[PDB]
Symmetry: D2
Subunit: 312 residues, 4 copies
């Protein structure tokens, strides 16, 4: 296409409307180099650990962007502070490859990222990262499956870009993704059925055997959060990884799995809660803390929230 709207062109025209300095546009450009290199890695991870390579890649592209200052990783015990010479205004919380272990089974996987603005005047620190997802200025994920898709939520909307592997560019294919109000699928690991707390268990039963003599929901569960959430966004439904006695505080980490997705969901008109509060309004105390998460089409998450407080 002769005037292809690339992710660069898209982000660039939006930063220009803020009368900014281009650090966002630098950032997402670097992150895109990481994403292409990792898609290429996963498309041949078989012909002859991987998440370590993936991680050193994302840190390097992000430091060299001259746009970050604190970086928090799935893979790193502490926050990494960008050297003064390369420091810039943003904080990035990211998981470089959620569920790497799934590549043997060829399950679609992805990089999840969340970006905050450091607001304080003192030295870069983990505190800058300990912010509520409600204050993210941008977020999204790149999914490596049949095709590589980068979905990006900013103040203006949720947009989806596809990698064109010929020209090595992410091209804009869906503008202002809005989720369906009510959907027909429920995504959850039912093999934890005995560990679930009452509200979930009533809702599972309500969807399988619908009290209103309507259609039972379809069950789906890829087993990798990006695959499941992306399907929930494009098709509608509910996705849950609730607390259970094995994972009492949930399992997905708040700063780099839950808050990114929750932000993408809510920006598309979806909702995202823990059962007791909005995921995005949780204030983190540890950069690696977990959350219960339930997200998806609005009426569905709500139906569940009623069962939660018709049980409180």
């Amino acid at each position: 296409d002769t005037n292809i709207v690339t992710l660069t062109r898209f982000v660039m025209e939006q930063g220009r409307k803020a009368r900014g300095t281009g650090e966002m546009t630098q950032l997402l450009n670097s992150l895109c180099t990481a994403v292409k290199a990792i898609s290429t890695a996963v498309r041949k991870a078989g012909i002859a650990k991987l998440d370590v390579l993936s991680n050193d890649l994302v840190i390097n592209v992000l430091k060299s962007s001259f746009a970050t200052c604190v970086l928090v990783t799935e893979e790193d015990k502490n926050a990494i502070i960008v050297e003064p010479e390369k420091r810039g205004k943003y904080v990035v919380c990211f998981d470089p490859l959620d569920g790497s272990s799934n590549i043997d089974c060829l399950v679609s996987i992805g990089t999840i990222f969340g970006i905050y603005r450091k607001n304080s005047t003192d030295e870069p620190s983990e505190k800058d990262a300990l912010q509520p997802g409600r204050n993210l200025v941008a977020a999204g994920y790149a999914l490596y499956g049949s095709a590589t898709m980068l979905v990006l939520a900013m103040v203006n909307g949720v947009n989806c870009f596809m990698l064109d592997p010929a020209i090595g560019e992410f091209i804009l294919v869906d503008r202002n993704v809005k989720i369906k109000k009510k959907g027909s699928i429920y995504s959850i690991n039912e093999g934890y059925a005995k560990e679930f707390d009452p509200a979930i268990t009533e809702y599972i039963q309500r969807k399988k055997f619908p009290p209103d003599n309507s259609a039972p929901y379809g069950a789906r569960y890829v087993g990798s959060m990006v695959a499941d959430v992306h399907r929930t966004l494009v098709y509608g439904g509910i996705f849950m990884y609730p607390a259970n006695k094995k994972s009492p505080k949930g399992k997905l980490r708040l700063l780099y799995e839950c808050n990114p997705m929750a932000y993408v969901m809510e920006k598309a008109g979806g909702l995202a809660t823990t059962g007791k509060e909005a995921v995005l309004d949780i204030v983190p105390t540890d950069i690696h803390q977990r959350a219960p998460i339930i997200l998806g089409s609005p009426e569905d998450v709500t139906e569940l929230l009623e069962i939660y407080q018709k049980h409180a």
Copy 2:
């Protein structure tokens, strides 16, 4: 970097047929299918920037006819069997589903091409009767998975070998030789949204997986919603995949000739079982080319565990 001794699928099937006194035909047929799979991998990968199953159908059909190795072809997109024109005939029957789950591309779930090849057992004019052979008589069967990578998994008389598309040279490269499934698995795959209508055998097996009597950890649940996806997962990691019958689909959903039987043959050659609940899928005699069948496949002990539950429920 740049390997000199590359084992491509063509080189490996060639080293099979040659020692068994091949004719050059299996390889002609298979190299044709590989072009079709490459061509479908790419369009799927650019799907959203560019029906795809109709085009796939036409493609798979044209590359197959041109192999000079086919005579009858069955497709899920074609009512009647296609009999290849005389000039291009050869001895095999290829039953195939060109693009499994094509509904799911929008949500970027891995989908696949499934195929079964029979050898014609008659001195006659090709007709769809030649396709109506049971699973046990398959010469080769396999699938192509369009996922984070493109995997072709061929199962033929000695075993199952996985291949992966090297997108640089455009070749399927041998990555796993002589595969064998785990014996006992830890994953069960079934659409529990249909839970209100399952037969009581299934209903107990699922609850046994969830709430184990003998205080084991429950089995995990996984269900991508694309048969190829869930089968490959079942083959590499083990477990059990169940698409049993429910009254709303009274004799199952999955079609016997080009979906159930290819998977059943790939499973059994890896040491798994594939049954409908009553009999081995591979011994059902096909009566209509688009006939349907319930299928349960997976790790031998898990299949068997569900069978004992079926036996005590009859």
Copy 3:
């Protein structure tokens, strides 16, 4: 490679040292999208004019960069003035695909570009483009052959970047290309032998039948300027498209063939002359004017210049 120096990372670190605004870095990034799309086009221009597509591509990526204001093309009669809303500080003179007609024969071909800074305060105009190549702030070419190579000359040096088609990125492979002083090849279309002016003709004879009983020069001539010049830069030699009675003012255009190459050559320690003056010191009056050009390793161009004024 986990910390790949991409053309973006290279240009970005250099603009940062000027305390600039990033328009250069925007520019070369957009130009790179054009170059990848055209390499992809040429790598299948056969499976089933092209230079028209190539041109609309380069103009579009360049306007959307918010970094240009006058664009001069091989293919356009007049200079194109960037709309106010997308205007920026640079001028780009470019040939989107020198020798397109050579793709039938599979001769390596390329995009040549030259960038000036508009220095005046008045409205953008062709005058801003009518500058001497000596004042280019950057220049180079992308070559589409066996591999796609972008060679870029800036105030700091000549560097060569190769496109890695897996990750869709130009990677830095040669830093500070310096040309050889004296080389062993002479590149010229000898089928014009009767049309050549005396100095050339003495020099051709001196290289074939060397008076010092030394080795005769090897002749080479691909027939596409980028192929020939790139070889001259990497291997050393002399390349000439002199004036001849068919082409009395030369044939290559000054603003988008000769001045870019001349600038790349001189920045690598090469020289580039018309026989009477340095190509880069010529002051253009028409944006589509031609020049005689003779460029290559220094001692060789000089040897020829002595024959020119041992004939003046």
Copy 4:
């Protein structure tokens, strides 16, 4: 977009051999060479980010042996002919230059793989004598050009057909069928740096091209410096390519079996001539596998014009 009726090289050679009662061998051999060409195209394209001719040699040799279609192989990188082991033998002789002009990669000039395939004419044990056949006895011959695109040009008994690598599906696609060269050309290709030592026949032809007696426009000069480059140019656009002898290379530079003869056979099947100046290259009897020969090929009238100059100079 996404074509359903893709004519790949495998499909086209298959439609040749089948009507002529093939054995499945030419196609086995050729599909092997295509993998080698794909693998060499990519490494060349990433050459500067990554000897390449040694690896190419090994690659071409392993893919060829595995075709079950070869018995003797001659390479410019190997002194003696390689005789394929018994298990993998078949009827053909492939003489090949794995990476012509590999010196030139640094300067990013298009280079190529050249190959000739003979059919063994003896009931004997394979030996390099089987390779010492003259050009006229070639069954198929061609080249692969690694340029702005990857072009494979196969010449076989009926004509020459160009194919182009579609980097998406990784297949060589038929783009020009039944090629024929122009009869009179306008380009002569020769390294005039060697001008001090050419034989007087050449010296007049070049001056006739430059300074035409009959007041035509002079011929243009073009010389890439890679034989494949200049040959393909000569085939598609016409003209004459001359690598004659000079005393400093007294019997020419280009080796007869795997460079001169493949080009000579591709030229003649397109209606061009290839001579040394005295005789047609295709009738010289090879005596050493690495023997050399002068070659002049190109458009029939231009070749002939230089020959009349050779006849009146003897």
